[PDB]
Design a protein around this ligand. Structure first.
Ligand SMILES: *[C@@H](C(=O)N(c1ccc(C(C)(C)C)cc1)[C@@H](C(=O)NC1CCCCC1)c1cccnc1)[C@@H](C)O
Ligand SMILES: *[C@@H](C(=O)N(c1ccc(C(C)(C)C)cc1)[C@@H](C(=O)NC1CCCCC1)c1cccnc1)[C@@H](C)O
Lengths: 305, 305
């Protein structure tokens, strides 16, 4: 019993973290096979940060200008290239600790684990969701750039996020491992604002099923609703519209609990309109939306890796 | 910026997890040097669970009755003994992945990371606090027994918790790595209740300092208070009494923010008496008490391992 924000075990990713230095900037890199991946702004200096011409800045850089260290060992850089917003440094040694891995671009609403790193060394691990506005609400200090986010399926690591920057509002922006930002963000020191941060409805519903599985049942009401009627309510509370695809994804949890999804929608509707009245659900006083239906099933069924 | 419940990187502990089978019970073990540590109730059968005589049950067990597997390899058991509520199985191979480690018995209010495991394989990692009543509010399913909790100081793993059991109320109880339970709990299927679950005051204060560091300042009031006056308030809300030792431990955060501890106590006092009025602090609608002052400093200063 119990329900916690649970990260994947990070050992397979720890063995891939390296330090990358160029000129006077150091940040984190990801060493898989004979390639090191890192944010391209490692090549920026203080005066280039407002509007850097990255292709021009790279003309000034040769292989030996990139210092890559794994522990106290340095890998010899034998090629370099830019792919969107990431640099790819070819080294002459394949990482012996390379796990089975894939690169994936995740959808808004999906979750992942972050291994926060400084100077190529791990500091901690925590679970994040890609917000609907393509930010993440992480915990990142200066020097954390190049830390990665990932999911694990048994023995295969799916890398989905590389951290690039903090926005002035204190939320976080980054890329997939092909260097394409999530959202409209650019890697420069300019005024960037995130759009409206809406709530991931299908995740809230999944967490309510988690609560029922754990015996927290006070919020189960005596109504049902329809998709269109629920969505009129969700729109006023800046919740994402619920679709039949979402209902189908909640199928496993509905079957386990015997609570129809539209019945659970009616309970959420009353929670939104009446609040929680000083009560809690799974130890929280607000509706939690950073657990996916898969996250709930994994945690309530003991899936291992 | 940002503040998250952050676990230690788990790689050093992942390499120590094994599966232990005795008769028909399987659970998790911790393999360090040539010893495997696990809960002694691995030797119980269905009929012994209400009141097992563990010393009598061990008479019936020889070395070859203990099956210990690390991945697909089995370690040969060459001795066994009981230390309080843990079994110590001597194997003929030292774990090549043994980290620098220590065993520690933590105090109530201190935090640690849990690597939840099933069948010797890691499922996830999350941060826990030892409650004042010596329970933990974990996420553990059947078969998680023998999962361990730990802290890391640079390169040294301090193991502090081995999971043994769930209470009927759904909270969790376990031992230090010398097999001594935290709290009054016993490893048998009998009615055990936890005592009153009080709030860790020094941790709430640390988290309020974390909030100020992150710019969440709305709760900073215009009063101060005294230790004795604050403690009259904390007693009514089942908060732990604040001591001068606690004030001193908050010294680093007080110095960083310029907010005297007793001023922060006055802000907490008003939060307790008036509630949060539908506002949030670091994304939470309730006062969080599972971050220690050290946890806040680590997360707000980027300490690595
Ligand atoms: C990476 C780093 O940690 N940070 C960073 C990232 C990108 C840049 C640009 C402007 C692309 C060269 C500079 C610095 C910082 C960060 O994002 N700071 C922002 C503050 C607001 C204005 C724009 C820059 C960072 C700080 C905290 C969390 N994540 C990232 C650097 C060490 O290479
Ligand atoms: C360990 C296991 O997972 N659990 C367990 C622990 C201890 C025992 C005794 C009675 C000491 C032999 C039995 C089972 C369960 C667990 O604690 N169940 C309790 C339910 C309430 C009555 C007492 C037993 C467990 C379940 C969920 C989370 N943690 C532990 C077993 C697989 O060896």
């Amino acid at each position: 019993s119990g329900f916690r924000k649970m990260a994947f075990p990070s050992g397979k990713v720890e063995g891939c973290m390296v330090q990358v230095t160029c000129g006077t900037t150091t940040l984190n890199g990801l060493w898989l096979d004979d390639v090191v991946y890192c944010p391209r702004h490692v090549i920026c200096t203080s005066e280039d940060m407002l509007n850097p011409n990255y292709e021009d800045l790279l003309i000034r850089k040769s292989n030996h200008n990139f210092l890559v260290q794994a522990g106290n060992v340095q890998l010899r850089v034998i090629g370099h290239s830019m792919q969107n917003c990431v640099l790819k440094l070819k080294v002459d040694t394949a990482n012996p600790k390379t796990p089975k891995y894939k690169f994936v671009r995740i959808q808004p609403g999906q979750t992942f684990s972050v291994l926060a790193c400084y100077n190529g060394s791990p500091s901690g691990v925590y679970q994040c969701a890609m917000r609907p506005n393509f930010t993440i609400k992480g915990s990142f200090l200066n020097g954390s750039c190049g830390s990665v986010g990932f999911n694990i399926d048994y023995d295969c690591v799916s890398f989905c996020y590389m951290h690039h920057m903090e926005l002035p509002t204190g939320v976080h922006a980054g890329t997939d491992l092909e260097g394409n930002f999530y959202g409209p963000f650019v890697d420069r020191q300019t005024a960037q604002a995130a759009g409206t941060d809406t709530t991931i409805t299908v995740n809230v519903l999944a967490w309510l099923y988690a609560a029922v599985i754990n015996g927290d049942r006070w919020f189960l009401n005596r109504f049902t609703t329809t998709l269109n009627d629920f969505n009129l309510v969700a729109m006023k509370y800046n919740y994402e519209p619920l679709t039949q695809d979402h209902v189908d994804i909640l199928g496993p949890l509905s079957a386990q609990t015997g609570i129809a999804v539209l019945d659970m929608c009616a309970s959420l509707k009353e929670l939104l309109q009446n609040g929680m009245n000083g009560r809690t659900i799974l130890g929280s006083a607000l509706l939690e939306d950073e657990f996916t239906p898969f996250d709930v099933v994994r945690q309530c069924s003991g899936v291992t890796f």
